[PDB]
Design a protein around this nucleic acid. Structure first.
Lengths: 65, 88, 31, 275, 38, 115, 96
RNA sequence: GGGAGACUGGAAUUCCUGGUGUAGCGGUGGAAUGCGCAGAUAUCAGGAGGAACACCGGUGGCGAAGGCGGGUCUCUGGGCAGUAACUGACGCUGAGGAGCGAAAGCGUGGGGAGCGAACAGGAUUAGAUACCCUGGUAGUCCACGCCGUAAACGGUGGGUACUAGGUGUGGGUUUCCUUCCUUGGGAUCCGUGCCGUAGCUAACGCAUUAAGUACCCCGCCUGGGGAGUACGGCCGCAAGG
């Protein structure tokens, strides 16, 4: 299918501060993209979702623009 | 649960030799410390039933270990009971 | 299992509960 | 808390007493005690102007510092928490660092040994007193002034608190314990926290004797009087008063606040009933 | 006569209704675009 | 007044459609409703009634000096696209389309299902 | 003595040159408590995704701190009391 | 998403205030009660409050079961893998007994936006103590306690060993293709599904997660109604169990 870019040897750590790394993972509506269309493992999907929520809380990402 | 430091000092106090971790005395001492910590935790959170179930499990395990010690040698059982301040 | 048995049991239970409701004060005063 | 009496006598069946757990001393401070005598509900003419008063235990007045405005920047330590017969709340005895002792109504959660500061530079811990301008919006306050210098008037009963809604201009909007929303000048000072002894309302007094100790005389219903005494009086057998309910002086029920008061402009919305 | 009623109370349960639900014989067919959804 | 640029808010529910041409600052200058053009009851949930209401509102804004509008569509789809087309067909240039439908993040309790 | 990361948003009105000293006085509670350490970083004047307390602009700050759980709560409580702080957030940079 | 506590965020509903703004809005299979012309619905700004946490999010995870997903912090329970350092049978089951136990309900004190038993109208109907519509109180929410029941179900008690495979998926260790990026592939341990042998079953089906082959301990059944009812007892504030 697709590639879990976070399990790789160059898998960048997931943060709620790096906004672009998360912007690549939310749809144009600001919703969190599903795991299948993304392809990452369940642990990394949970990390992505938690980071997105944290970033929304500190007004780094829109709450569904 | 307990961190490594309390585990080591308790084991040094109650371990039969300087290596054993699975002797009934060591297991009972560790269980006693864990039970006291859990009791003080549950004094504040009275509605943490899930942790209370784990407390019950620990109490049962300690009871079984003390039963084994008493059936093996009553002198060790009396010594441990008086050293740890337990009733029965 | 057929729901017929459940229906018979439920009609019995419903009738008994109705009877209990109809004689609450009488039972309380006799006991 | 609340201690419940066992039904040993018919007068103690459902009764309960306050559990004086926060009290740390059974005597008042001698230098802060003033004499108090009962009036019997009678004014300067010797006439009963308030019914159902008289009798009751002797009590002495403790001077309460409702005007905490001179000890700005001077810290105090909570020395004791005491019982006050003149109010539902308890009082805390403060030891100021300069050597002065005072009384304040004890806020909720205050403990012996705490540190109480006051002024614009104080923290927002319970018991601290600062002008409303320096108190952030949304906090819970008590013992609020009405004019800048008149002393605390609002939110003084046990368990009662005021919620500070927001400040605009020179006015801060507050939500009274009654639910009424009011505006007050920001220069008015207030104390942070709720008032303690919040469970005192749940006390079952048990017998008429306790109310007589508290200084309440029995109340006679107007329907069992004669028409010369009460508008509801008269009639053979029991009756409902034979008319719309009225006061003993004939005034009918309804709003009694005087219209066009000067304070009508300072009130956002009055309290509500039946909602 | 009970089975014959045919007034509104008799046929309110049979009305296909069920918006996008309970496919019935007279249920409204779904409108379909010319192009594939993708 | 003379507002050359404006906003059109279309609310299409399951039994009505409300059009209100609005000054970009949020002030309403001309509104038309599905029942305002002579329909009533179940008749006003039809796309044709939405078309009539949209055209009526478009005219009532056009004599007010409104030439260019942006549309904020909203509500379950009943006559939304017909309303947009009738807005364009009545001499109004429709620039941008935005679907602003209030989407709760799982908040209040919905009413019970009908049977 | 656990490592924390504390992100604060300060209102945009105040001068950016006074942010660095003003924070340092705020972190005096963690410094004096139990021999703790900070690494204060500033990247301010960034527009918010949504309006916060009638503000669209904001000055972001990131503080990396290693203190006692009681200490950091005390620092957090003071920060929210201050009116120059719009919002704040405390993370544990441990495995949590 | 195991549990408890504290603090906190945004969307939306409701209401209040103020603009713009007019004559309808709302609701249905179709309508009428209802709301509005005293300025409603719509639209914009501001404010208060409560409850639930969209996307992630599934036949995926955790928990003994009931059950558990907005965020952060504090405190805390269990599980799995590897090493195998330690004790050396300390195991299993468990009558009675104790604890936990959805929802509804009960008590005391708060709170109450939405939803909403009861209750009011409207409609349908031969009749509507209903279905549908408009309102709407308890309740739903919080704290502290009672209750102790469910289609509390996998309608399958717990422990252990053995008996063809094939294929998904969750957690962890490791050899070999080796770019070593790659679900590369294999091996192994622990879960969780689907299909399928032998075997079992009245049949349906189950089938290495057994309803197969066996051993230990517990619970329960003995035709259908009467009846999980009467009498007695115990428990409970009561409902009732």
């Amino acid at each position: 299918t697709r590639k879990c870019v976070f399990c790789s040897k160059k898998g960048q750590t997931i943060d709620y501060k790096d906004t672009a790394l998360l912007r690549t993972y939310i749809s144009e509506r600001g919703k969190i993209r599903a795991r299948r269309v993304t392809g990452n493992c369940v642990q990394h999907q949970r990390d992505i979702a938690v980071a997105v929520k944290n970033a929304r809380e500190v007004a780094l990402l829109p709450f569904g623009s | 649960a307990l961190t490594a430091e309390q585990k080591k000092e308790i084991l040094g106090q109650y371990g039969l030799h300087d290596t054993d971790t699975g002797s009934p005395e060591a297991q009972v001492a560790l269980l006693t410390k864990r039970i006291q910590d859990l009791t003080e935790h549950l004094k504040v959170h009275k509605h943490d039933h899930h942790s209370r179930r784990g407390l019950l499990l620990l109490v049962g395990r300690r009871r079984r270990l003390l039963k084994y010690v008493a059936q093996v040698d009553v002198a060790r059982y009396r010594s441990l009971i008086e050293r740890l301040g337990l009733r029965r | 299992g057929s729901v017929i048995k459940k229906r018979r049991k439920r009609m019995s239970k419903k009738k008994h509960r109705k009877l209990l409701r109809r004689t609450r004060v009488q039972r309380r005063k006799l006991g | 808390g609340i201690r419940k009496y066992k039904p040993t006598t018919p007068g103690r069946r459902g009764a309960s007493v306050s559990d004086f757990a926060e009290i740390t001393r059974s005597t008042p401070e001698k230098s802060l005690v003033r004499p108090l005598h009962g009036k019997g509900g009678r004014n300067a003419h010797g006439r009963i102007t308030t019914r159902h008063k008289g009798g009751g235990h002797k009590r002495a007045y403790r001077v309460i510092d409702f005007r905490r405005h001179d000890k700005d920047g001077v810290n105090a330590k909570v020395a004791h928490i005491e019982y006050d017969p003149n109010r539902t709340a308890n009082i805390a005895l403060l030891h100021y660092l300069d050597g002065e002792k005072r009384y304040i109504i004890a806020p909720q959660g205050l403990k012996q040994g705490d540190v109480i500061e006051s002024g614009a530079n104080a923290d927002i811990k319970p018991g601290n007193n600062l002008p409303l301008r320096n108190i952030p919006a949304g906090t819970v306050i008590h013992a609020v002034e009405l004019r800048p210098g008149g002393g605390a008037k609002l939110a003084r009963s046990a368990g009662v608190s005021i919620q500070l809604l927001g400040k605009e201009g020179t006015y801060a909007a507050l939500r009274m314990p009654s639910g009424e929303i009011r505006r007050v000048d920001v220069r008015c000072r207030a104390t942070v926290g709720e008032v303690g002894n919040a469970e005192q309302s749940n006390i079952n007094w048990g017998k008429a004797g306790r109310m007589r100790w508290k200084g309440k005389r029995p109340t006679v219903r107007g329907v069992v009087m004669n028409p010369v005494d009460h508008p509801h009086g008269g009639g053979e057998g029991k009756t409902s008063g034979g008319r719309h309910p009225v006061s003993p002086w004939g005034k009918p029920e309804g709003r009694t606040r005087k219209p066009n008061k000067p304070s009508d402009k300072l009130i956002v919305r009055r309290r509500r009933t039946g909602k | 006569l009970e089975r014959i009623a045919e007034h509104w109370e008799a046929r309110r349960g049979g009305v296909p209704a069920e918006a996008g639900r309970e496919w019935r014989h007279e249920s409204e067919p779904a409108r379909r675009p010319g192009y594939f959804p993708r | 007044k003379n507002v050359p640029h404006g906003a059109a808010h279309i609310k299409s529910t399951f039994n009505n459609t409300i059009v209100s041409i609005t000054d970009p600052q949020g002030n309403v200058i001309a509104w038309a409703s599905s029942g305002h053009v002579g329909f009533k009851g179940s008749r006003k949930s039809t796309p044709f009634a939405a078309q009539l209401a949209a055209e009526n509102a478009a005219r009532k804004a056009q004599e007010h000096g409104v030439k260019k509008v942006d549309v904020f569509v909203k509500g379950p789809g009943s006559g939304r696209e017909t309303a947009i087309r009738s807005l364009q067909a009545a001499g109004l240039e429709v620039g941008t389309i935005s679907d602003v439908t209030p989407q709760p993040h799982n908040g209040c309790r919905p009413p019970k299902r009908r049977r | 003595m656990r490592p924390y990361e504390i992100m604060v948003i300060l209102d945009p009105t105040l001068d950016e040159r006074t942010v660095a000293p003003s924070l340092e006085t705020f972190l005096n509670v963690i410094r004096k408590d139990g021999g703790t350490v900070d690494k204060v970083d500033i990247w301010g004047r960034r527009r918010l995704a949504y309006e916060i307390a009638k503000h669209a602009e904001g000055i972001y700050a990131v503080i990396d701190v290693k203190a006692e759980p009681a200490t950091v709560s005390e620092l957090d409580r003071q920060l929210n009391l201050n009116e120059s702080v719009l919002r704040t957030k405390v993370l544990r940079t441990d495995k949590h």
